[PDB]
Each structure stands twice: as structure tokens, then as C-alpha cells.
Design a protein around this ligand. Structure first.
Ligand code: NI
Ligand code: NI
Ligand code: NI
Lengths: 251, 251
């Protein structure tokens, strides 16, 4: 029979799915502010199709962000999400009022305590090995209060090919055993085994099923690594010029 | 500024996207009739997620089928589509009341009159070459009143691998120059150059833009060949276990 709401549950990636930075848009084209930088100034935007799409989607379905952003960076997203969120590559679940889900935090803590020393050392070694290559890098450990989640590294050369080289060497030096990687644009991330958008979306669906039974689930994402959580949905979707769509084009 | 409707225009494939035959569903699981066979009896069904999804989508957006079915087979689809349709692999556009679009019919006629003799001969040769292989086939020319569109061939062996063999030989005998092919499940189709879902969706969007300007366009399809029209949308989407999704999985 029917229980709860019939409307779709839609898991949406954020950066380069709902909005993007200025450098990824054609100059002068109209835009709406979607994110702020740490100094409080606009730094991410929606074009006219994008703001029309997310407005319709938020009005029509239960929309849940599934993002690499940590909680602070997610709080700089200026979109009226009302159902909570998955943050930090699946390391964090937020309730609808923005408060931290204590149960998931306990489970993630358990999965991640074997990595708490390795993560700062891995970021340090990557940033050193990057300067050894002569590359001007930038990186840090993404973390919540008390718990370190994953390592991120960016380049300042305006050449994303730099990061593919480091990934090749770090892999050969055997630094990534027990971990998986995300690479898209100027972003290279090293994630512990038990940290994944897929795991948090899997838990979100388990909880939803007790309230709403089986209802249509849709996943939207732009990265190849977003296929993890997107594969848990009944239908998945991607922007026409995404990293994922471009890879499908070449297949 | 804003003009017309803001709601998304959603192009949806039909078979194996919104519904499927009984043999493609787990026995005994609940279902809703979605299509009738030529004898008027149910032969295609939606599972509970599928009927919930298409109901929500029809209510929330302007939904336009984009189907290989000819007009007669489309008329046996028992879903309340209200905006017209693209049929016969892009060879036919129907108005919302089901009447034939005369302009597109004239354009398709022009593209297809160099193929009017080749299509019946190609179906005959394929069905003969199939029996030469010892395979029990079935095929015909798909056509509207006066105009032949494409060739379809099916096998009766319960082995879809049979069709991949014929495609290999027919290609070597040089019978498919100036044409493209569709193969998914128990369906192998040979299409003339100017016959494509992509071309009809392209024309549909050109016409829509004069009424509604630029609004979000979403494409849903299950076949690799559906990527043609799906690439014209802002976002495209596929069922989790589709032919397309399975190919992406292997990439
Ligand atoms: Ni993204
Ligand atoms: Ni289909
Ligand atoms: Ni129902």
C-alpha cells in the first residue's frame, strides 16, 4: 500500500552540477549568486537554465545535497535546501535544521579512526612531493570537529594536468593502499575506504524506507566518482557537458 | 526576460525506460498495464516505482515521448501524454491531439525518398541471410501512410546474440552505407541517415524556443542510441540497469 510521501527523493551533487565558478562560464553571461567565498563575497553562480532548474526541482521533489564540501563550505551555499544534507564526501549527515547527525558521526568515527594520523601525513607528503616536481600546490585535511575525513590538493598553475602526474607517482610509491581517489578539474582527493557519498546515500535510503517505503529515487552528479551514489538511485542524471558525460561520449 | 512556461521540457523514451514487457520483470511482482498488444491485451507494464515516477513527471513538467514505435504502436501506449509525441525513430511528430505534423512529414519525405526501394529490399535480404544462418527471424519495414521509415528485425530463438551476428555480416557485405543502426535487446534496426530521434528533438526545441524561450530540457532514455537526442538536453538521465548504464559501468 502507500505510506508517507509519493514524491521522488532526489540526491544532487553541488559544484559543477547546480552551479560553478566564474572561470567556468562564458564572460558576461547572466548569473545568480549560488555560493560565497570565505570572505563573504560571491564566488559561485547559476546561469539562467540552472536557477530555473533548481527552483523547479526544489518545488517538485525532496532534494538532498550530496557534496564534497565540508560543513562550513556547505553553509556558504545560498540555496534554500530544506531536507538536510550529506557533506564531506559522505562523512557528514546534517538534519534539516543543519544540526549534525550524531549516529552517522559515530559510525564514521569508527570507520576513520585508523586513518587519523595517516591523513595529515599524506597531505604533507603530497604537498612536498608536489614541490619536488616543481609544482605550486595547495592542500589540507578536510575535517569536522574531532574527526579528520579526507585529503584534498589543488594546483595554482592553471593546469589541471599537474594533478594527474602526482596521482601517478603517489600511486607508484604505494601511498594509497586502502583508499580511493577523486579527480575532477582542479581537485585531487584521497579518501579512506569507509568514506564515500555512496555509503551515506545508502544509509539515507535505509532510513527513508521506514518512513516513506519505496519511492522513486533520482541522482544528479557531474563527476565519474558520483556514479557511486548515483548507482543506488532508480534513475541517474548528469549535465550534458560534465566530466561523466564527456567520458560517455568517448565510449 | 521570461516568456511562456518556466517548467522543464522532458523528452522520454518509452520501452525499457517507462515500462517493459512481462519477461523483463521478476515473476509475480506488482504491475500496472502500460501497453496493449495488437489484439488489445496487456503486454507492457510498470512496476510500482515506474508508475509513481511517470505520474509525478507528467504532473510536474511538459513530457514528450521520443519513441521507435510507429504511430499505431504508440497509440497502444496507455499513458496520458498531453503534449504530442515523436514517433518512428524521429520520423513522425504528432500534435497533442494525435494528428500528424504535416511540416515534419514533408521534411522527412524529402530526406527519405532515396531509400524507399532500398528499405523493403534490405529487410528481405536480412531475413533471407538470417535463414541462411539457420536463424528463425522476423522483420518488416516500419512505415507511415505513403512513406517508409526504417527496417526492423527480431529473433524468435530467445537469444539476442543472434542479431549481433547478422549485424556483423550485413556490415561486411556493405549493405549499411549511408545508414546507422540500433541494437538493444531483441531489436535490430537499420535507419537511413536523415532518420534520427536527435533530428526530431532538435526541430522540437527550435519550435519550442519561439514560444517559451530557453527553458530546462531533460532527456530520459535507456539505449546507447538514445544518447543522440539526450545530448541535446541540458541534463540527461537513464534507468540504473539500462543498456546505457551497463555500458557506463564497464567504462
Ligand atoms: Ni560536482
Ligand atoms: Ni527504449
Ligand atoms: Ni501506487
Amino acid at each position: 500500500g502507500h505510506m508517507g510521501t509519493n514524491r521522488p527523493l532526489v540526491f544532487v551533487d553541488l559544484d559543477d552540477t547546480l552551479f560553478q565558478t566564474s572561470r567556468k562560464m562564458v564572460e558576461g553571461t547572466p548569473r545568480t549568486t549560488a555560493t560565497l567565498d570565505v570572505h563573504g563575497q560571491p564566488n559561485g553562480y547559476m546561469n539562467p537554465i540552472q536557477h530555473s532548474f533548481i527552483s523547479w526541482l526544489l518545488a517538485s521533489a525532496d532534494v538532498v545535497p550530496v557534496t564534497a564540501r565540508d560543513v562550513e563550505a556547505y553553509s556558504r551555499v545560498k540555496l534554500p535546501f530544506t531536507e538536510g544534507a550529506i557533506c564531506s564526501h559522505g562523512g557528514v549527515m546534517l538534519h534539516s535544521d543543519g544540526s549534525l547527525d550524531q549516529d552517522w558521526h559515530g559510525q564514521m568515527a569508527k570507520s576513520l579512526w585508523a586513518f587519523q594520523d595517516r591523513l595529515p601525513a599524506l597531505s604533507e607528503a603530497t604537498l612536498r612531493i608536489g614541490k619536488d616536481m616543481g609544482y605550486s600546490l595547495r592542500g589540507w585535511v578536510v575535517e569536522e570537529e574531532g574527526l579528520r575525513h579526507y585529503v584534498v590538493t589543488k594546483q595554482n598553475e592553471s593546469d589541471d594536468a599537474v594533478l594527474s602526474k602526482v596521482l601517478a607517482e603517489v600511486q607508484a610509491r604505494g601511498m594509497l593502499e586502502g583508499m580511493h581517489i577523486h579527480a575532477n578539474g582542479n581537485n585531487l582527493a584521497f579518501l579512506p575506504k569507509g568514506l564515500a557519498k555512496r555509503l551515506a546515500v545508502q544509509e539515507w535510503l535505509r532510513r527513508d524506507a521506514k518512513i516513506n517505503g519505496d519511492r522513486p529515487v533520482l541522482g544528479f552528479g557531474d563527476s565519474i566518482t558520483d556514479l557511486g551514489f548515483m548507482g543506488l538511485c532508480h534513475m541517474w542524471a548528469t549535465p550534458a557537458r560534465s566530466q561523466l558525460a564527456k567520458a560517455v561520449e568517448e565510449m
